[PDB]
Design a protein around this ligand. Structure first.
Ligand SMILES: C[N+]1(CCCS(=O)(=O)[O-])CCCCC1
Length: 253
């Protein structure tokens, strides 16, 4: 068991395990969603670092922060790698179904896992749109509390595969290429999301995390808490913003 693995189990508040199985992945992903939030604050504080195993262990596992896709998915990638799984990073581009257009090119990073000769997409970083389990490339629908998810082989101008989702009809989440990439592509996604003028993540604070009974979202101005059949939206002032970061998301800057 490496230090990365130990800090990871600790971060997720789940049992240490010297042998991690495939059947375990779903519950680790669920635990990761409950504990590690999607957040962009290091872009705004201008203290993002190079994407690496050490920097990420320190930011996410030691300092109990969250991150964006190019931080959360490589984090899981490293955990999965030390756990003996055959894993790879892939690059893609998110689609903005609302406005019917692509997000910034090559802004997304994700993880693919090989088990028993079959491919699974491991997705823990796509905001709150989380499958909470591996998504089989064979095409099977994964049902989670955040919605439905499936992979399709499909050439677009942003990849040769797609992650589709709902919840009302199937809509494109992101397109990606199955071709393997490394940390340098991850650092490039960061640069893109930090710098590009059309990036959704370099203007205002954005923090989301799943919870027991739904999810919670925070911005410069408002806190949204969704439970089942109930949503609360409320204004947040600068004075309440530090407490909320800590109390709802375990974030201390
Ligand atoms: C296929 N598509 C996405 C459609 C968007 S939908 O929400 O309906 O799934 C349209 C532009 C070409 C590449 C992406």
């Amino acid at each position: 068991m490496t230090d990365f693995q130990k800090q990871f189990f600790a971060r997720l508040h789940i049992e240490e395990k010297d042998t991690v199985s495939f059947e375990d992945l779903s519950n680790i992903m669920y635990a990761m969603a409950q504990t590690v939030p999607f957040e962009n604050l290091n872009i705004l504080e201008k203290n993002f670092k190079e994407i690496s195993k050490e920097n990420l262990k320190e930011k996410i596992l030691v300092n109990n922060r969250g991150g964006l896709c190019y931080e959360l998915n490589p984090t899981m990638y490293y955990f999965l790698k030390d756990s003996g799984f055959d894993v790879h990073l892939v690059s893609g581009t998110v689609y903005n179904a609302a406005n019917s257009i692509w997000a910034v090119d090559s802004g997304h990073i994700a993880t693919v896992l090989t088990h028993h000769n079959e491919l699974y997409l491991i997705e823990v970083g796509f905001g709150s749109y989380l499958p909470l389990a591996p998504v089989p490339f064979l095409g099977e629908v994964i049902h989670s509390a955040t919605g439905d998810y499936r992979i399709r082989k499909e050439m677009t101008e942003k990849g040769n595969y797609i992650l589709e989702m709902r919840k009302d009809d199937w809509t494109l989440g992101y397109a990606f290429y199955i071709e393997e990439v490394d940390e340098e592509k991850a650092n490039t996604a960061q640069k893109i999301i930090v710098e590009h003028e059309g990036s959704p993540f370099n203007k205002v604070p954005l923090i989301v995390k799943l919870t027991e009974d739904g999810h919670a979202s925070l911005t410069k101005d408002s806190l949204t808490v969704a439970k089942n059949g109930k949503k609360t939206k409320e204004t947040v002032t600068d004075m309440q913003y530090t407490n909320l970061l800590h109390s709802k998301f375990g974030i201390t800057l």
